[PDB]
């Protein structure tokens, strides 16, 4: 149950950065749920890359390759 470790205010911040002025108390849970979905979908693949390579350690590259696959490509970790 580390999902709650994503703290109410920590979300507040993210949303603030988006350009959010006011935030329903329901949001926080909703957001958590979404985040889970996101990471899961990603990591699943990311891991599945790792599973193929015969490595028990996950590399940054595995992460990227997955992010790229999931159409949310990432620069700064050497794609």
């Amino acid at each position: 149950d580390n999902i709650q470790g994503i703290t109410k205010p920590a979300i507040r911040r993210l949303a603030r950065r988006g350009g959010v002025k006011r935030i329903s108390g329901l949001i926080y849970e909703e957001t958590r749920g979404v985040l889970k979905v996101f990471l899961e979908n990603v990591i699943r693949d990311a891991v599945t890359y790792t599973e193929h390579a015969k490595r028990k350690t996950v590399t940054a590259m595995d992460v990227v390759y997955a992010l790229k696959r999931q159409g949310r490509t990432l620069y700064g970790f050497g794609g």
């Binding site: 693949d45 599945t48 890359y49 599973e51 193929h52 390579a53 590259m61 390759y65 696959r69």
Partner: protein, 94 residues
């Protein structure tokens, strides 16, 4: 010239699943395109899978892992199977 297809294979498979049901030229052409896409999607993911791990040889293993990623859970499972089944059956049929 000779414009190839999959149209003939579709038919055999149709009759294996619904013997007493036909299909339209337009739908056939669709099914045709459907195949080529997924083929290309898989081939592609596989080609990368290979190129990522410094291999020049795409094996039955690479295909599988690709499929796992490209197909949703239940669909992939049923496929992973019908794959594995098709491999095993060929390595034993010489």
């Amino acid at each position: 010239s000779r414009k190839e297809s999959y149209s003939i294979y579709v038919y055999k498979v149709l009759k294996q699943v619904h013997p007493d049901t036909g299909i339209s030229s337009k739908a056939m052409g669709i099914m045709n395109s459907f195949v080529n896409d997924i083929f290309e999607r898989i081939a592609g993911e596989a080609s990368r899978l290979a190129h990522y791990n410094k291999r020049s040889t795409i094996t039955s293993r690479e295909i599988q892992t690709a499929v796992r990623l490209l197909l949703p859970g239940e669909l992939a499972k049923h496929a992973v199977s019908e794959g594995t089944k098709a491999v095993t059956k060929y390595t034993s049929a010489k």
